[PDB]
Every structure is written in structure tokens, then in C-alpha cells.
């Protein structure tokens, strides 16, 4: 089911949240790290069902931005459906230390022949969200690659389609 969160404004207003319209829903696009948003555990890909007793269905990015930017009082009430597009794939490193994919800017671009990724049906045009439960959204690729380096032989990645 959805979950209810109650965010509390910083001084300035802002709650460290960028939202985005996809297929007539509203989705979390970017969360700042020590923000009202992060306190209530908002993550990349979370679907925002309602803000202050109003459904987000059919809202544009521009409208989500404005409703948030103009919110009255200290409390912002939201109803959140947790990353409904999220998928989880478990791969195993081969002898060279590879699971079998090429990525760039946080996104899987190709699947390597005869690899664990290929075996497990990993898909392209998907964003990498977590590696062994560790957020990689906002990281440089080289940071993603070292996180992969220090994961085990068993690598669990969380993915979502790109939009």
C-alpha cells in the first residue's frame, strides 16, 4: 500500500525535492541529502499520489514544482507509493570481476554476451538505483564502478525504466 509522510519545511521554505510528471503521475526525480524529503525517506522513483489532500494525477512537472514552492504553513502532507517501477536483479561476478553490462551516466546501455547479466535478463535503457541496497542515484559513474568493486561476488541491483 501507499504510505503517509509529513514533511516539515526548512527555513527558506524548500524541502529538497524535485518532482517529475510521467504517464499522468508524479514521481520523485531528485532528493537532497539532509533535507525535509530525506528525513521521511523519499527516494528516486517514488510515486507521489497526493500532496495536502489533492491528487497529483494529471499534473505537469511545472505544476508540482509550483504547488510545492507555494505550500502554506510548515507541514507538507504526502501519500507515497514506493518505487512502483522498481525491479531487482541478482547477478554473480565472473573471474574478471564482471556481472556483464556497460553503463554511462547511471544507465545500462548494453548487455555483455555470456555474462551473468545476460543470463538474468538485465535490460538496457534502465537507470541503476541501488547496488546491494546502496543508493547510486547522483553519483559519478566512477563511484558506481568502485561500489561494484567492493560489493561481493553476488551483486543485487535495483533498476527502473528511463523516462
Amino acid at each position: 500500500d501507499p504510505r503517509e509522510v509529513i514533511l516539515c519545511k526548512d527555513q527558506d521554505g524548500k524541502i529538497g525535492l524535485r518532482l517529475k510528471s510521467i504517464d499522468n503521475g508524479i514521481f520523485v526525480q531528485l532528493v537532497q541529502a539532509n533535507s525535509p524529503a530525506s528525513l521521511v525517506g523519499l527516494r528516486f522513483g517514488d510515486q507521489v499520489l497526493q500532496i495536502n489532500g489533492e491528487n497529483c494525477a494529471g499534473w505537469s512537472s511545472d505544476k508540482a514544482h509550483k504547488v510545492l514552492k507555494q505550500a502554506f504553513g510548515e507541514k507538507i502532507t504526502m501519500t507515497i507509493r514506493d518505487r512502483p517501477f522498481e525491479r531487482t536483479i541478482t547477478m554473480h561476478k565472473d573471474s574478471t570481476g564482471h556481472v556483464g553490462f556497460i553503463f554511462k551516466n547511471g544507465k545500462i546501455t548494453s548487455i555483455v554476451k555470456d555474462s551473468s547479466a545476460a543470463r538474468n535478463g538485465l535490460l538496457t535503457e534502465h537507470n541503476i538505483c541501488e547496488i546491494n541496497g546502496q543508493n547510486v542515484i547522483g553519483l559519478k559513474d566512477s563511484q558506481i564502478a568502485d561500489i561494484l568493486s567492493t560489493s561481493g561476488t553476488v551483486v543485487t541491483i535495483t533498476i527502473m525504466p528511463a523516462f
Binding site: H98, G100, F101, I102, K104, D141, S142, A145
Partner: peptide
């Protein structure tokens, strides 16, 4: 490249 190989 600037592709990373996972």
C-alpha cells in the same frame, strides 16, 4: 569511452 564496464 566514456562507458563503464560492470
Amino acid at each position: 569511452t566514456n562507458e563503464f564496464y560492470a
